[PDB]
Design a protein around this ligand. Structure first.
Ligand SMILES: *CCC(=O)Nc1ccccc1C(=O)Nc1cc(CCc2cc(OC)cc(OC)c2)n[nH]1
Length: 271
């Protein structure tokens, strides 16, 4: 494996810990890195480390190398999981990335749901979550990157409650129609998923198309039907969800427009 002077981190400055909230990102452990911030080379920081299983194939290795190479070119953004360094020489490949201690957005909202039945996570807090994801997506789009699985489960939450998009590069209920069986994947198909993600945010980690079996979905969408306004959702946000769900990909808003619209709601929204 080649040595990249810009990214190589010494493995003896990395002490591996417990797996990160169990498998959903394929062999990721929490770790303590020493001198990750070169200003204070003595200082310890909590990081995430992606590696391969002992049973991994040649393809599995090439896939991790490709992911590492894409993360080297993407640059930095506060609302994405950023590459911190790599351990490639004299040992197994280690991909050091940012740690999001509070886990995925879905579980984050589900745990903060109001107890008991309807007869602590206000609208500005929810719009903040959405705005942050839209900004991370607008960034990734500018770096020629299409997600392919933009769901609340792929948005990670840090100790500082910052939203971070993970796993950028079937989850049928988040997929745009043109990707369902024409098998596309564009920036417009990411906007469709962003609309489903808005619905998950305002339902506080609710499962989309509740009750509808995965096979009945394609017909539902072909008839022009979409999910109804969640019980506690600002009308402007349902309007945005509906624009993300246009059948024609060219009719959907761009992540730039979504950022603009989400900002106005963030400033104005009550409750
Ligand atoms: C199942 C998801 C989940 O909820 N996980 C979780 C639960 C409780 C606490 C923490 C977590 C968690 O997964 N934290 C976490 C993972 C990561 C890095 C994941 C990752 C993302 C990439 O994006 C392209 C790339 C790589 O490595 C190549 C790893 N950080 N914090």
């Amino acid at each position: 494996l080649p040595l990249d002077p810009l990214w190589e981190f010494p493995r003896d400055r990395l002490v591996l810990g417990k797996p990160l909230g169990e498998g959903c990102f394929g062999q990721v452990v929490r770790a303590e890195a020493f001198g990750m911030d070169p200003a204070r080379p003595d200082q310890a920081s909590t990081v995430a480390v992606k590696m391969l299983k002992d049973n991994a194939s040649d393809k599995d290795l090439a896939d991790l190398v490709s992911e590492m190479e894409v993360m080297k070119l993407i640059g930095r953004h506060k609302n994405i999981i950023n590459l911190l360094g790599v351990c490639t020489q004299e040992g197994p490949l280690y991909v050091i990335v940012e740690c999001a201690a509070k886990g995925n957005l879905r579980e984050f909202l589900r745990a903060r749901r109001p107890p008991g039945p309807d007869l602590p996570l206000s609208f500005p807090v929810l719009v903040s979550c959405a705005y942050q994801v839209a900004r991370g997506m607008q960034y990734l789009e500018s770096r020629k990157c299409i997600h392919r699985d933009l769901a609340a489960r792929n948005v990670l939450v840090t100790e500082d409650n910052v939203m971070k998009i993970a796993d950028f590069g079937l989850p049928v209920k988040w997929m745009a129609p043109e990707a369902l069986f024409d098998r596309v994947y564009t920036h417009q198909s990411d906007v469709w998923s962003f609309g489903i993600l808005l619905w998950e945010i305002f339902t506080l980690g609710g499962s989309p198309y509740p009750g509808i079996p995965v096979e009945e979905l394609f017909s539902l969408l072909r008839e022009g039907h979409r999910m109804d306004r969640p019980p506690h959702c600002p009308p402007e946000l349902y309007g945005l969800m509906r624009e993300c769900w246009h059948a024609a990909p060219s009719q959907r808003p761009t992540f730039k427009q979504l950022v603009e619209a989400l900002d106005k709601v963030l400033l104005a929204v009550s409750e």
